[PDB]
Each structure stands twice: as C-alpha cells, then as structure tokens.
Design a protein around this nucleic acid. Sequence first.
DNA 1: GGGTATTCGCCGTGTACCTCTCCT
RNA 2: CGGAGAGGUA
DNA 3: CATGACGGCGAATACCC
Lengths: 34, 390, 54, 1319, 147, 49
Amino acid sequence: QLTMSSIQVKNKGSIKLSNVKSVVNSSGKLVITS
Amino acid sequence: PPDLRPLVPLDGGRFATSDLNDLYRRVINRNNRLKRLLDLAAPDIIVRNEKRMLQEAVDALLDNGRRGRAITGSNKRPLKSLADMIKGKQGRFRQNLLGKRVDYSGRSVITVGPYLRLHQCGLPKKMALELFKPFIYGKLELRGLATTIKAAKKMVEREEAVVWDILDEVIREHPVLLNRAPTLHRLGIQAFEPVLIEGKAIQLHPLVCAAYNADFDGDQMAVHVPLTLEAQLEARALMMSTNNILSPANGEPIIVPSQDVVLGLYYMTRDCVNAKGEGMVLTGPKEAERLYRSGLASLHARVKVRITEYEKDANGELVAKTSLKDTTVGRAILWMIVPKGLPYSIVNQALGKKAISKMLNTCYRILGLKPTVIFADQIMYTGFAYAARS
Amino acid sequence: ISAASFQETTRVLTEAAVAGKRDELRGLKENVIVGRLIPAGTGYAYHQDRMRRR
Amino acid sequence: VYSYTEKKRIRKDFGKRPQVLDVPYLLSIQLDSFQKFIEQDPEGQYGLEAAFRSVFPIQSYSGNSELQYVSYRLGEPVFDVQECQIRGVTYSAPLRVKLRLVIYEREAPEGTVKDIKEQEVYMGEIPLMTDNGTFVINGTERVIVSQLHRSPGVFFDSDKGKTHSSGKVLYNARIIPYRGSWLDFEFDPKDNLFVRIDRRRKLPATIILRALNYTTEQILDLFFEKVIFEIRDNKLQMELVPERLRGETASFDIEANGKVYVEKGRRITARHIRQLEKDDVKLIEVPVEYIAGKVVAKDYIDESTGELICAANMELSLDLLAKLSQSGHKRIETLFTNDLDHGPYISETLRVDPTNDRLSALVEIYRMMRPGEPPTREAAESLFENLFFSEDRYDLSAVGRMKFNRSLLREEIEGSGILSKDDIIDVMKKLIDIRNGKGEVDDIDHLGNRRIRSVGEMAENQFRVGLVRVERAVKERLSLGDLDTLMPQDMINAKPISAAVKEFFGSSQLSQFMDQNNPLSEITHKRRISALGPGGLTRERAGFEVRDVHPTHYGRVCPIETPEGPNIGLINSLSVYAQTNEYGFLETPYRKVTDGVVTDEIHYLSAIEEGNYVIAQANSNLDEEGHFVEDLVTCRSKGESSLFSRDQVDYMDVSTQQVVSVGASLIPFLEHDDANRALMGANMQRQAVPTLRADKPLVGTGMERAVAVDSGVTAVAKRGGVVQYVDASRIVIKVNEDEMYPGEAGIDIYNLTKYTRSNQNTCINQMPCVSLGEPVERGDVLADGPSTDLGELALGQNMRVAFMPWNGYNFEDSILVSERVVQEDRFTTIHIQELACVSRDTKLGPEEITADIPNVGEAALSKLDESGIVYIGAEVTGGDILVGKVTPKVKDSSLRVPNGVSGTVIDVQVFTRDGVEKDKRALEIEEMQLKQAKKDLSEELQILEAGLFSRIRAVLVAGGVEAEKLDKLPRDRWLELGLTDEEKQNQLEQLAEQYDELKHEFEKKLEAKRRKITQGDDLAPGVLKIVKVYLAVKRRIQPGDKMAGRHGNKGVISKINPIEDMPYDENGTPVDIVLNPLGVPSRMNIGQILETHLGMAAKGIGDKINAMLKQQQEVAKLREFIQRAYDLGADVRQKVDLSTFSDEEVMRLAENLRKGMPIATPVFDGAKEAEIKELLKLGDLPTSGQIRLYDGRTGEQFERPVTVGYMYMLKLNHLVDDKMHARSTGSYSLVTQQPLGGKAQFGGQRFGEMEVWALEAYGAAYTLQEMLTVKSDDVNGRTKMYKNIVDGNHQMEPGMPESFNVLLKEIRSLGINIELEDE
Amino acid sequence: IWAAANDRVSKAMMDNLQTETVINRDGQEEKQVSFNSIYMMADSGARGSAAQIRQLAGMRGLMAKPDGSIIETPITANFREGLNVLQYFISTHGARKGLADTALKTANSGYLTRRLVDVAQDLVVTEDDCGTHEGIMMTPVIEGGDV
Amino acid sequence: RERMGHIELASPTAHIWFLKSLPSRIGLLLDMPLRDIERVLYFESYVVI
DNA sequence: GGGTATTCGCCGTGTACCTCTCCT
RNA sequence: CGGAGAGGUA
DNA sequence: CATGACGGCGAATACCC
Ligand SMILES: [Mg+2]
C-alpha cells in the first residue's frame, strides 16, 4: 500500500515558550536567542 | 552419497545432466591425470598445469563461479555446485527446511458462500474425500465394512453411499486450514469447519475476504487438514475465524461488512421524505417487518416505533427501557438482529461502512466475542437480502 | 543456523566453521529447520520442560 | 454496394469518421520478414543470399584454394504441414547451395586456375513458415516473436548525477555494432575521457587515438584550436581572433588601434565583442605572467643544438617561456581553453595517459583485451585491427551505419560496416561538445532509437553463426589437407548450420509455443514485440522507464495491451496500422495535409520524422473539400499536444483506432473504460475458449471480420464461383469462367479441419457457412473456424445481464448464472487431450502392447480390441485402460485414462519402427488410411474430371458443335482417334491434355502415398511403437469457472441459479446472468454499461424482426423496419439501401437479424449515448436502459429499476476442473523425501516460508511441526501418522526430516564438519 | 487555472448528485439526500469515492507525463462522455506507471517483510513481569497545527 | 543416501570458501594479500617457506 | 609510514499455483 | 522425475 | 562469450600529506 517563513496559531489557547529568555527590545517584543 | 545426486531418467534410455556428478567427474579425471603424471616424474611445467587445473576443478565443485569464469555445461547455463545446493531461494534452507510441500493438502478456486457462518467454509466433497482418506479407511475398518486396507480403498474409489456417510461423520468438527497466497499476516491462514458442497470450488465466507485480501475474480486457495488432536485444537482455539476477528496490527475488527452488505444496510436504514407509511405508529420491529413485507409501508418511511432496548447496569444485568422512537421502518426491522445490550441509537441513522464498523465495535466492547460473531453473520445476511431487494 | 538460512550462507558458514561455532536450538527458525516444536505458543511449555530438565 | 455474401448479415456501423486506409493484413510482419529471409535477392541485401556473400569466398590461409558461392535454392519439403504435425517432425525445406571449389596453379603468376569443381551441396533443413506466419518445429506450432532492441549506431547518454559528488553529470557515448565489439567513451568526475572495449576496465581515451597512428600534436590539432603568440621584440604580444576572448574576464587592458577598450577587472560581455566589428586588432600585448596558466601545443626543438626544449602539450611556465624566447623562437603555440565551453578534456586525458606512441597504445590495448597474455607487436597490431576494422569480426549494419551518420549529422546514408578514424574522432568530438553544453543526449526508450528484428533477421543471424562455424572447419580442412580431386562436398559439414538453426527454432527465447486459445490469441502472438531475448532486456532487471508508455509509442505500440506482472512494459502489441520500415523502425501512416486540405495521400512516418511535423488528431472534423472545419485543431508536434491553425497542420491521423492494438480495437466503447480495465479486457479476450456454438457479438467494433479472416482459421475462397458441393468436412467451388486459367477445370477444393486439438487442448473445428449452389466471391468466408461466426470473430456469447446484487452470490466480482445458460450449452466447450502410450525396449525384454493384461477383469477390457487398443467412439472414464501394455519384469504398464478425465475416444494413431510387426489394429488403421488416400486421389480426381468435362462441353459446342457425337461417341475418343485436325479439337488438345496429365499426376503419386502410409516411421531410440489416443470431453459451465467481458470485468461463477429463481421482467423473461453493479464505479470500466444498453437496443431490434418473422408480415414491412434501423444514427458513415436488395436477400438478412442486429461501435468513433437511446426507442425499449425486475423466489418487484441488457461474455481458459486438486498421500521426491509438486504429479501444496511465519505468529506449534515432519519428509513419522489415523489415534511421533540430513551431508561434502550433539 | 476548474466541476457535480427534490406530505418541494445508485454506493462507503465519481461524471483532470511533469492541458472529458484518442493515450501513461509500480514494489515489500521476520523471529514473550521501572514517555503526536 | 565417499587428492588443494569468501581467512591468517595467494595457488608465483 | 577519499568486488532484490517444449 | 527456457493466473 | 541494474557495504587502493 506504500508508494515509493512565519508561524500562525489557528485556534484559541494560551502561549507557552520553553528554553526562552526575556530581554530588552527596540519595540518591546521578545527576540529568541536559544 | 549418490542417492542425494541421482540421475533423472529421460524417456528411459537417456539421462539429463545432473550438474553435480559432472563436477565430481572433472575432479576425478584431473586427480587421475595428476596421479599418473606424479609416478611418471613428468616435466614440472605440465605437472604444475595439471595441478592448477585440478585446483579449479575442485573449487568449481565446491563453489562454481565464485572465482573466475563459471564452468559451463552442455547448455550455456552455469553448472550448479555444492554451495548452490544450500544457498539462495532454491537452496536447501529456504526451499526444503524453512518451507516444504506437505501431505493432506489441496487447492481450488474460491467462490462466495453467502449462507455460510463465520466459522464455516464450503469444501468440495471430492476434495474432502481425497483429503480425509485415511480417516475414511479407519472408520470403514471400525464398523467392519472393510476387512482389509484394499477393501477400504476400493470402496472409497467406487464412492459408495456409506463412504459419503462416513465422510460426513469424520469432518463434522474437524477444522481445516484455508490459505491464500501471499500469506502477508497470520490471518492469511485461518481455520474453518468444512461443509460438504457439490462442485469443485471452495466456498469462502465474505467477511473473511478482507483478512485474506481475497476476492472472486480467479483467486485460488489452499486447504490443509490438521491431523493430530493438538493440531485440531490449535486450529479451533487459535486459528478459527471466529477467534481472530481483530487485527493484530492495530486491534481493529477485520470482519466489517463491505460492498453489497454495506449497501443493503445503508439502503434499508435510509429515510425518505414522503415514503409510503409515513407517520404510522408501530408496536415494534415485528409490525414494521409485517408492514414492509405486505407492501403497506415503505422501507424508508419515517415512523414512530415502540422500541425496548437493554443497557448493562453496574453489576452487569441488562436493564430494559421501552420508549417510543422516531425512526424508519428499515431501522426498526434491522433492530431485530441487534443483540441485547446495545443502544437503539446505533441503528437509528443511515448506516454506512464506518457506522457498521462502529456498531460491531460497540457489540464487541459490550457483549464479547460470540455475540459479535453472531451479530456480524446476521448483519451480512440482512445486508445481502436487502441489497437484493433494493 | 538462522544467519545461514537467512542470507550470505557461504560467509556465515565459513565464519562458523573457522570459529567452531555451536548452535543451541533456541529460536523459532532453528527449531523449524530441525523439525521440532518452536519455543513459542503451544510448544513453549515443552521447551520449558526441556530446559528445566537440564 | 454490398456483395451477395455480405448481404447475409450486415453489422450496423455507428462509425462517423470516413475510413481513408484499410486495415492492413494483420500478419504482414511475419510473412514479409520470412520472405525477405528466404526469397532470392539478386542484390544480396537480405536473407540467405546476404549471409552467404558475407562468409564466402572461403579462402585458404596461404590462399592457394578458395571455395566460391554461386547460388542457393530450397527444395520441396518431404512432408507438408499436416504430416509434420502428425508425425511430430519439423516442417522444413532442404537448403541446396551451388558451391565451386577453385584450386589455383601452384606458383601461378596471379590467380591462374588449374581446376574448377562446381557442385551443389546440402547444408541442412531450413524450417519453413506456414501460410499463417507460424512454424512447425518437431510437430508443434510455434511463433517467432519479434524483438525490440537498441538500434546499432552511436548513442550519447549521461547520468543525471546519481554516481559521484552532487549534480556532477557524467556524459558517455556508445558505438553499438550489429556484430562486433562495443566501443564506449565516458567522462570521469575529473573530466578525463576514458575508453572501454567490450565493457572491460577503462583506459584513457587518447590510447585509441594513439593506436590510430595519431601523435600528441595531431590529437591537439584535432581537438583544439591553435592560439599563436607572435613576439616581435618583447612584451609577448598575442595574435588572435576576437571571438575567442568572449566569456572570460579581461587579463589585460585590451587595446583598439592603440586605444584601450576594457581594462583589467571587468568581464567581457556581448557588447564588448560587438564593438570589435570595426575594431580589427590582431597583435595584442599581454603580461608575461599571464602565460603561466597556458599549454604549449606543438613539440619544439632549437635550431641546431638538438635538445628537446619542449614537446607537445605541456604547462607553460615563466622559466620555459623565457628560455624558449631567448632562442629567438618567435611564435608560441597554445591550445584554446575555456571553463564552460572549451574545456581541456583531451589535454588532461593526455596528461593522465601513460602511453606515448602507437606501440605503447597497442600493447596497452592487448593487456586490456587479453588480461594474462604477454603480446607480440604483431599480435597487438592484428588484435586492434580485428577489433573494429575487419569486416569479418566487426559489422555496423546498414541501419547501424545510417543511425551512426545521422547522429553525427552526416549527409551520407550509406557507408562501410567498419569504423574509420573519422568515425571515432567525430564520436569523441560530439561527446565533448555535449559536455561543453552544445548538444543533447539521446532518449534510450525513444522508438527512433529502438528497432525491430523479426523472424527473418534473427534466422539469418543464426544461419550466419552456423555458416562461420562451418567456415572455420572448411578453412582448416582446406589449407591443412593435401586436397586433390576432392569435391566441395567434403569440406562442407552441415551439422553446425543445422544445429544452430534447430537451436534458434526450438530453444530460443523468442521461439514460443503458440498461444492458440482462439484466433485472437494467434493474431496477438504473431504481432507481439518483445524487449526480452538475446541482446535485449531481462524481466528481473528492467526499470520503470523502459516499461513506460513513451510518446513515440503513439500509432506504433499499443499503450493498452501489455502483460500484467513481471513482463509489464516489456511485451508489447503492434498497433493496427503500424509497420516496420526498411531499417526495422516502427512507422505509422498519416494523411498529408496540403494547403489546409486533408488529402487521401498516405505517408508512413517513423518516430524520428514524425516529431518534425504538426499532426492533427483523428478526431478532427472535416468537410467534403478536405479543409478543417475549425480554425484551431488539436495536434501533436514534438511529443507534446496543443492547438494549431489549419495552415500549420502538416499531417492527420488516418483512423481513430490507429493507436490501439487488435485486441484493444476489439473492445466496444473502449473510450469509456479506464486504461487498467481495458488492459485486463484485452488480455482476457485472448484466453476465451471457443464454445459449442459460435455466437456473434451483438455489440462489436467492426474489427471482428478482419481478425477472423487474417487469422487463417476460416476457409476463404481463393477464387469466385458457385458452391458445387458442400458437407461438414469439405467444400467444392465451381470457379467462375472469368477467373479460370486456360488449362484447368476451375474446381477449388477446401478440406475442413475437424475436431483437432489446439496448443492449449481446445477444439479446432471448421464448419461450412455456405450452402449448395451459393455464389461466392474471392475473399468470402466459406467455412467458419473456431470462435468465428459468418466470418466474424465470435469469442463468447451474448448474455442477458442484469446489474443488481443478488443475495451475496455476486459479492467481490462473483457471477450468478441462470440454469438456462447451462441447459442451452451456451458456454459448453470441447477439449481434446492427447494421451501417448510408448512401448520401448527394456533390458529384460521388449515391451508388448496387447489385450492380455494380468490382474484385470474381462469387463475392464471390453473397450479394448484384439490388439489391446481402445475402439474409436468408446466412452472412457478415469482409470479406464486405453492401450494395454505389459513390461517383462509381466507388470501392468497399460496407458489408463487420467483420473476424472471421462471423455470420448475420437482418434487413434499408431507409429511403428522399421522391423516391428505392426499389430492388427495397426493393420486396419493402415487399411483405412490407404482407402482414404486412394479416395483423396479418386474423388478429387473425379470432381476435377467433372470440371474438365464441363469445360470440354463448353469448348466443344463452341465452333465445333457435334450433337450426335456427344452420345454416339463417349468422352474417351477425342484424344487418340485419328482424324484431320480443325479448330474444334485443336483447342481441346490443350484442355484435355491437362486431363491426361491428371492421369499422370493423381495416379503417379498413388504409389508414393502408399509408400508413405506403409512407411515404418523413425521413432525415438529404443521405442518399439507409439499409440496416440485423442479424447474429446465436453466441459459444461459450473461454479468456479472464470467468466469475463471485454471491459476487464472478470469474475468467478458462484452459483447456478434455477430458472424460476432468477430475476425476470414484466413479460416473464428471466435474465441469464446477474452482475454486481458495485464492481463498476471504482473500476471505472463504464463501457460494459454502455455495451449493455447498446446490447439491449440490439436485441430489441431483433425482437421486432423476429416478431415480424413469426407473424409472416410482408417483405415490404421488414424492408421498412430494417431500413429505419440501418438509417438510425447521427450522420454515420455506413449507408445501407435495402431497395437494392431482392426480396429473398431481405428475407435472408431478416432471418440472420432475428436474434439481434449486430452493432459496430469503433473504439474512438463509436455510438453516442443519444444514438443508443434512439435505437432503444426504435425497439420500444426504455431509453434509460433500466427495466422493472421481479424476484423469481417471491414475485416481489425490486424496488428500483435495474439495468438489464445484453453483454458479450467470454469463458476463460481457467476452468475449475483443471485447477481443483487434493492429495492425502502420494509419491515423494528423491533427494528430499518431501511430497512432489504439481497437480499433474498428484503433488502436495507447498507450505512456504510465509505460511510457517503465520503458524509461528499463531503459536500453533503442533500444527507447524506436523507440517514439517508427518506431512512431509519425516519418512518414519508419516508412516506412523498414517497407521495411527487408520487406527483412530490422532497422535504424531515426529522425527528428523530427511531434508535436514541432506543439508548435513551437503555441508559435510563441502569439507565442513557439521554434526548433532548429545542428548 | 485548470486545477481550479477541476475543483469547480467536481463541486458542481457533487452538489447536483448528492441532493434530490421530493414532494413533501403537503404539495411542497423539499431537499433530501439523493437516492442515485452511484451516490448511494459512494456515500455508504460500499464502493467508489469522490475521485472515482468525478472521473465518471466530472472530468478526469490533470495528468502527468512519464517523467512526472504535469501535462498542461487536462482531460476535460469524463468516462461517461468518453475520451478522445489523445486523452486516452495521455491517461495510459499514468495507468502503466501505476501498474508497473505495483509490480516492482511487491518484491521490495516482500524482501523487507522477510528481513523484518528474521530480525524479530526469535523474540517471544517469556515472562509476566520483569519488574522494570523504565518506560517511554507517550505524548500525542502533533506536527504543529494538527493532531 | 547416508554413506559418503572420499577422494584422495594427488596434490593438496585449497578450499575456495576459506580463500575467496571475503575476508580471506587464509590471507588474514597469513597477512599475505589475497592477490599473492591467488597467484601462488593458481601457479603464477612462488613463496619462500 | 599513516589517515582518509576513491575504487572494486560481493550481496541482495514477493508468494502460491497452472500450461508448453527441450535437455548425454 | 530434476534442471533450463517461454507463457499465464491471483 | 555479453555488452539494458543498481543500491549498500566492506576490503583494498591510491592520494595526500
Ligand atoms: Mg483477485
């Protein structure tokens, strides 16, 4: 049977980031460094 | 040993190339030449050449073609060496040890048996007579109809009536194994109780076809007879189709109805807006069946039916609740084959393939294996009948 | 035995013969080849009875 | 206009496209190929003439004597086809070749002859092709399947990465001769050219050039353009042509007329180059260090010092340029080198080439060709010459040379069969410039690169192999022998040629046992194209690409008909109009479009030339003047399809069935079927078994007549005339006067084949389809063959089919069949089985065939005669004795009927060796054959005599009328009676002379035929006699049998339903077969539905005509209705005017139409749905094709309308009788003690590896153990098991299988100590 | 554009095929699930699917060349209307590709199955509980945006 | 089918399984390359013992 | 003399069943 | 009855 | 003699220090 850019959340829910740090920003929105 | 390398007679007079005795002959020839030059004390060049030739003769006998040109026979086909005897698909291990031809076996084209129960198969009586022959001989000796072996053989060859009665007696609960190649999973071989049928084709239960990946466009199947009590009980308890209704790969049922059974259930459980008999209030499924069979109500008519359903309580007893259901005539008719303990909502819908599979899942989860097998057989009978009637 | 019956029979048998290997009939293929009850299913207890007697 | 024969039953054609080209003779490829092989060719281009002229003259090593070929001829075959089939011998002609041994005068000046011995010599038997394109080899009918192979020539391929690093494309070229070594050139990842001869180890490419007597500077001149460095005083100024510098960056400030144009650091562009059109600078100064990355091209020496300062092709450096300059050497030679289009591949290959002259190249080539051999200069100088430059050992064929020159863009088509220096040089140059991105690689699967060899070409090749094998012996016996007075017969030993030809015709992969299930199977077998065989592919190794439908397959290879499974895409079917060209490339016809007008001029285009034109589709509407009615026609241009204006269109397809094969062309409504199911239907049409009664398809395509006629299974009138006599075995036609040769009676005799077995044990029976006194035209079918009905292919039966589920009996493609089908013998088939009984010569004594058999009762031998041979017509059953034989052990070795093969004895043949006293049954069989042969020389004598006397009557009453002498003087007194001659009997002297020659022809061969009957035929060594018994058995349809339509709708019968149980309509008519509708939607083979509808319509027409025949209506009424039926359609091409038919012809046609009007629906020009509904209206049938059915069991109406119509159903050769098999115990193999294999050997089923895996997964250890031991090679275990089962004890005592012991002994024989340990 | 046209044709065909009008108890029109035989077989799940229905009564759609590139002009006809010579020849490419793919993939599947059988042949449940505390951490399989 | 025979070889002969089957057991056991063993066994060279 | 990229020879490539001819 | 070749069925 | 298979892998080879 086998044959040989930018992220967008699509539903309601809380956001959780892991292995992430909080730093000062020019616009105030956190960058990622890890 | 020579009996492991025989010479096959061709038309009696002449023999085919054994492809193994030839290599032995070359080895013996070169050994004799080297011996008759060793005592001769011949010049060393020809003696060395003969030693070299004996060496290629020997390693051609052991592994022909492993080094250098493959020594060739009368035809261009390479000679088959000792190493070839034990390796490859045609080698000893794979062709004669990991698999082999067996006695008490047969094969035939498969046809659909729609009347069969899940644990039954349709065996041609000629195939059964040949397969169970020593059992027939034993039973003939037991009741004194055959004094000797030859008498029993003659009675079986003549196919006397008492021989057929004995054959019916022997196979009553002796399971047989049905197999369809390729055997991709254990369920490619399953056990069934044989039923003697006329003709020459094996009858297969529809619900096991999916397990076999079988259909009836030319497929053939092999049948095997478990001889011993241990083998018969293994067939019954381990391999019988009624004991193997769940896929070992994912745990899902394998005996879900397909094609015309699904079509029949779907057609009879469909609803029509203005079908004949709409708005009638029925005492139960029996009245719905009576109205449908008498032509007074359409199979898709939206009606009210008093339905008594059963639900398992905390301690496992079936508490009965009776209520008026807004349903169709066909759904009420199908309710009669639903075993107690299942809710009426499982049939109060247009039943497609997934709905039927879910109904079988619910029956297996609530009631167990035997009611599930009975329910599946009843579903298949009803589907066939109402697909025909549609 | 199992490796030889699988693939590369010449190489496997050469390795076994040079090393003087000894094969205990413990797997399914090995017992199938010698025509014994496999150490699984209904034969499993038999093999257990064979093992506990040694 | 319709002829009298075709007025019998006119098939209604719904085809709308006019037919511009007739379907060619479907067997033309085989006959034309064999004709080219055998026919005399004065030019010597084809066949036996060419093979002889390419091996002769056979000259001695010294050259004193040579054998010269003059001519050849093929003698009359000793036996014709039928006798060869009966006696089991090859149908062949003796090859008799006129040779001439020439011995020259010893130390003659030059070529002076001293004797010329011209003799005819026999070089063996050449198997002759039959009238239908088959061969009779050892009495068996075989087909030589045509082979599709890579054309000879030069082919440029590459690897699209996939071999080294990433995306590094390696290019290669292959010179493939028809005969000789393969020459390969290739690029390595470092861009060096390597050369391979016969797929050996790779050598540097420049070695071949060095062996072609090319030095380094010559090679550089061939593969590079010289740049010159013209130093006058200093600064290293550089003469060049501008164009060279384009593409690469500026190394120096290029100056124009003393003014710099572009400086360093700026890459030169196109505008830079175009500025130099009026800037013609030649001497340009360049930096000294610029020369560092340059190569000196020529070999330089100083004036008179004699020191090699620099040889050809080396990296120039500052020291080398400075010292070369200090000697006044004014001009420096370099090679032009770029990075993208002028790469130095040849230079680098030379840099890695170890060889440096012709001697080194030749010795290296010797070392590569003959590894392990130390070579003499002469040995290498001859080996290299023999590789590619001797006609005897190397041969580019005419097609090979043509393809080679075409690939290199050479105008010349003809050329030499051997390679030249320029050939190799041009191949290397094209490979290099393909690497340079200037050319393109070739398509391996393109049909312009794959050609066809048919029977003639491969037969000639094998004959050449035999000829050269004989040539070796002739040369050695000629040179080494002190020959004097010896005739050329002495040197010619015909055994090699005969052996090679017999091997080709009996054991070659393409010499295949003919598929003879039905005439369509024969046609398809004769038309298959095979990519397998010698020089082709292998089914285990062929990849996806070669199995794909290539765009060039259009009109040449059918994209539908190919075997399922391993052979898919490797075995193909020739397209209907496809034919091979002179070079063997498949070509297909097209109509030329001139000035926008679709003319009727037909041009056959091959795959190469077809891609250069715009070709319109066959489904393109035209007008009476030939112009395209639309202005945007769909066309194919270069393997792509798009729209074009009519002026662009260069060609048009000749027919809508051009792309399909014959089998696919026979599928009605093919365009409504999915290609997979169409493939299945085309494959299964060939497996249909001829039934008891041939039944025409109600829905056809129009190709049935061509298939039936071209197959040769029918009797076709050679000349027109009147049926003078007719019976089930014979037809005698009285030829028309206008078709008579002067000296003949005008009688044509057609003896019909009666109840003879086919290659698949089916019945071949011819029955006449003409009556006494009927007029017949040339090409008319006189007798139908198997599966033919009035000259139309009739593979199956028209079945009244309903599409509905019926209680599960049609589940998973199962078929429900009414008992009425069984009762009417619709699918009952005749099978003829041949049993042989051989009495041989044993050591103890000679085997005897007699009626005296021990240990058997008298009643069991009542069917045997006094000779112990079964009577003709005896109804035998399984176990009955056919031929009683005893071996002097006497043991009972009589030939018995195989179990369950109950049939009727229809023929007994007896073959006895010389010196054996033939038995009484042999004597009476001989007597019957003698009487029948005398009858064949007497009835065929008196019928021709009656024709001659009719012609004598006609001539004698013409100018020489003598009424009284007719009866007062018999017809035996016109020959010798002495009288003065006149015009009356001088003409009779020419017409009765042939009569008297039949007194010299029929009677003269009577003794020869008697000798042949009385002949004691040569049998196999040790065989005393052979008795062949032919058994005819009628196989009636039963559950388990396989049925199929033409649409891929296959199934197995599950039940024979009683007639009262079948669904029936309002008129009480039941359906014949109930098919499951649910197999239609997912399969998408909708044609079976449409055919069904059309079938219904067809039957409806018949249902009306039958009614009009039952009511005895006026002939005018039938005229009106049948004319309305034929006129129906949407502008169909067929026109049937009943007004031109007589009343009797109309009645005959209506009688032939009363069972249903045959309909023709071409595969892509077929009946539309609206036309089908119109025909349904004409028959007063519902336009939906669905009617109200009632359940026979209950009478209840089925709730919905059911599609009911007529489908044409085939019984396939997959009967359950042949497949059912069972075994409890039986014989066992010799080495392993496991049960035998096969139903024919009463063998057991193989419980293979996956079965054992299933048993292990169940944990059924005891069942597995009994499979391995008591049911297989455990000899003691199986005996104990059988005894225990007889005793009622279902218990086993398994032991060691013998196969394990065999394995242990085999490993021990390999010098390995394997053993079992203790317990 | 041709893919969008195929989607539109499929949507129109399914919309017209899946619903039928019927007189209600009163003389009023009402929409209901169609009783068309092909639609009933597909919707029930007995046989057929959306792709097969649109091949029968919609359009066959875009086809692929043997090398895999999509042919620019799709097959606008369906099996009821019948294909022309060009469309049929185009479809034979995919049909042959699929059949040969099955033929050459069955061997690879069998070889993989045999290798798996050997590597796992001797593994048998030999104990009730070994007493291990280690285990693997089972979470729902989520690739991002779907379960 | 159980009793085996023997052939007394006039000269010693190398077993191909222990020579050709990679890795060469004789070659690895002796550190002379398989090429030299092939040439010596097949009479193309000599070895000093 | 030692590490590592390239080469060369070997290993493997679905099951079951059916028909035919031909083979020291 | 072993092998080879060819074809076919699922 | 055949020259239409190819991917994976380990031992041997060669190249580059
Ligand atoms: Mg099938």
